[PDB]
Amino acid sequence: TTIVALKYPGGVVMAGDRRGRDVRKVYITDDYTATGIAGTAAVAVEFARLYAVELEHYEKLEGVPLTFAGKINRLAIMVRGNLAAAMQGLLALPLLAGYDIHASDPQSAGRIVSFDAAGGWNIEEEGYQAVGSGSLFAKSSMKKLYSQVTDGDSGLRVAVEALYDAFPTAVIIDADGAVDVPESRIAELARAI
């Protein structure tokens, strides 16, 4: 299913479709990252947990978190060696929303990284990216509405509208860290859309 992520002046927002089983597909992995898997929710949560362990294990052992390039690499190795998903025919390609705290400009410090099946990756320079079922519809919607993205609220508004064009859950990441968007605010926006 569809997961969108777009940059705004201040950070980055990632929103993903959902529907006592796991249902969510976008998860905060550390203080400044969030992973959104186009696929089943239980695959999305287990992938996010293993990646959360990987990032935390490094910080506890080295006394310092991985650089943002280090964070991408560890996610790329996980995609490269995902034999469990390959054997079972399950979609497990993640989209990464991150905030580089080491970037000189905090306003454009938001980051979106795409990953292919082989583990190859590319940092998005367009300021928006969509993966999943309605990715083509969500990307075209974001292209036409991206000029209206001025802050976190407008960035969340465009992200929700792109998913309707394709309630969902969302994660906002800025200088203060990654925060789960209250479901009341997304419900308010989806009704307005």
Side-chain angles (χ1 to χ4, degrees), residues 17-80:
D17 287 324
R18 74 175 195 270
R19 73 202 174 213
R21 58 170 286 250
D22 299 307
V23 284
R24 202 161 54 171
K25 290 155 202 286
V26 173
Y27 297 93
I28 297 169
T29 45
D30 81 344
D31 289 326
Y32 288 98
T33 56
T35 55
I37 283 207
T40 57
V43 163
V45 71
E46 184 50 53
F47 194 93
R49 191 201 60 83
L50 286 158
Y51 184 56
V53 169
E54 177 80 358
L55 299 171
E56 176 67 9
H57 176 261
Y58 183 94
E59 199 217 323
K60 283 186 78 69
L61 209 74
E62 298 292 313
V64 63
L66 286 148
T67 53
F68 193 76
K71 296 181 179 181
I72 302 163
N73 176 58
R74 303 308 172 98
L75 198 57
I77 298 159
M78 281 177 64
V79 180
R80 189 198 303 164

Side-chain angles (χ1 to χ4, degrees), residues 120-136:
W121 56 268
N122 193 241
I123 303 163
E124 189 62 61
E125 293 299 319
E126 288 170 32
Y128 58 89
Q129 178 70 290
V131 288
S133 295
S135 59
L136 292 161

